[PDB]
Amino acid sequence: LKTAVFNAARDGKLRLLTKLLASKSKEEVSSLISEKTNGATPLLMAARYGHLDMVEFLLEQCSASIEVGGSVNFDGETIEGAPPLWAASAAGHLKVVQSLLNHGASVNNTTLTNSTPLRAACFDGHLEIVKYLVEHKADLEVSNRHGHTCLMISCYKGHKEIAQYLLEKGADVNRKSVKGNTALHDCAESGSLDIMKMLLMYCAKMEKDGYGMTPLLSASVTGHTNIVDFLTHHAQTSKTERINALELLGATFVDKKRDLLGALKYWKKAMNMRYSDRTNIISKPVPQTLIMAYDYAKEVNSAEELEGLIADPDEMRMQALLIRERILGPSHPDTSYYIRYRGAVYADSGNFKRCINLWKYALDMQQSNLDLSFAELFSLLKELR
């Protein structure tokens, strides 16, 4: 019975439901409206799929399913506890949002992950819904259960207009998530040099997160050269922080971009800064010990130890593992990840001894620095709406 009233609400057939709602009274017309049809409610599905004409009629019958959290689907994943206003926002259904609000829907009702209607419109970038929600008393600084703000997710998805608008309306540029992440990091991870420049217009301070990473280092890990190039001349970064970032960027060039000539370019830049002031030379730190996994290798220490490298791809591969463990450390997932990557390439090429040693080392790293896997494979946090 009601399983039929709801599948026409989802699919949007408005003529059918009007005749099924003429063959029943106004007291039980509310019981079918408060359905459990595949976890959602007739009013929720009516908002997720933008059926404005039928959402307005659904509400003239009973405005009591209006803050109900049910199940919705986006990008294949499924979201629990999403109210209808939130879902109308994530989908871009601007006029469904306006109608939902004119009938007195809370602009502050979130999903179970505590994602506001405002944050939902920021994900896919619906600027006009964002403006409307802000004008209807949305709170710029309610974040999800991880502390990811609207401004943050807007920077991560590269939405300059929306990020600008949120800053214009007074959003705090220096929020830290629970993991210590700031909107400046989301600019770094997305290569949004534009939005990074705009955040700096509001004196955005450049900090480490829980993992110890600055945006400058975060841009090096994820490989966005425009950020790393931009920040090697920003006065808010020190000399050895520039050096390390260029050097770590080189590692990303060797292992992530598979580009030895790009890597040497950045390693040379880093080398010059190290040996630019002869009265204070930045020597490479010296690890506790040589590592079998790294073939007992040692980081280059002079501009000329860099020249005889390009004809030696293996030394560069071992340089990159060394540089990464030095800068990122054993706790950053990229270190073990690229050790295992490296081991895998060696397996493919023939030396299984190199492979197993790298894989053994990575497991001892993954297990000795404790609080991804090979089967799993046979960041995701920020794509949460």
Swiss-Prot record:
Keywords: Acetylation, ANK repeat, Disease variant, Repeat, TPR repeat, Ubl conjugation pathway. Pathway: Protein modification; protein ubiquitination. Widely expressed. Highly expressed in kidney, cardiac tissue, skeletal muscle and testis. Expressed at lower levels in other tissues, including cartilage. Component of a Cul2-RING (CRL2) E3 ubiquitin-protein ligase complex, also named ECS (Elongin BC-CUL2/5-SOCS-box protein) complex, composed of CUL2, Elongin BC (ELOB and ELOC), RBX1 and substrate-specific adapter FEM1C. Substrate-recognition component of a Cul2-RING (CRL2) E3 ubiquitin-protein ligase complex of the DesCEND (destruction via C-end degrons) pathway, which recognizes a C-degron located at the extreme C terminus of target proteins, leading to their ubiquitination and degradation. The C-degron recognized by the DesCEND pathway is usually a motif of less than ten residues and can be present in full-length proteins, truncated proteins or proteolytically cleaved forms. The chain holds residues 3 to 390 of 617 of the full protein. It is linked to A dominant de novo FEM1C variant was identified in a patient with neurodevelopmental disorder with absent speech, pyramidal signs, and limb ataxia. TPR repeats lie at residues 243-277, 336-369. The gene is FEM1C. GO terms for cellular component: Cul2-RING ubiquitin ligase complex; cytosol; nucleoplasm; ubiquitin ligase complex. Belongs to the fem-1 family. ANK repeats lie at residues 1-29, 38-68, 80-109, 113-142, 146-175, 179-208, 211-240. Changing residue 186 to K: Nearly abolished binding to C-degron with an arginine at the C-terminus. Changing residue 156 to A: Strongly reduced binding to C-degron with an arginine at the C-terminus. Changing residue 74 to A: Strongly reduced binding to C-degron with an arginine at the C-terminus. This is Protein fem-1 homolog C. Changing residue 189 to K: Strongly reduced binding to C-degron with an arginine at the C-terminus. Changing residue 75 to A: Reduced binding to C-degron with an arginine at the C-terminus. Abolished binding to C-degron with an arginine at the C-terminus. Changing residue 124 to H: Found in a patient with neurodevelopmental disorder with absent speech, pyramidal signs and limb ataxia; likely pathogenic.
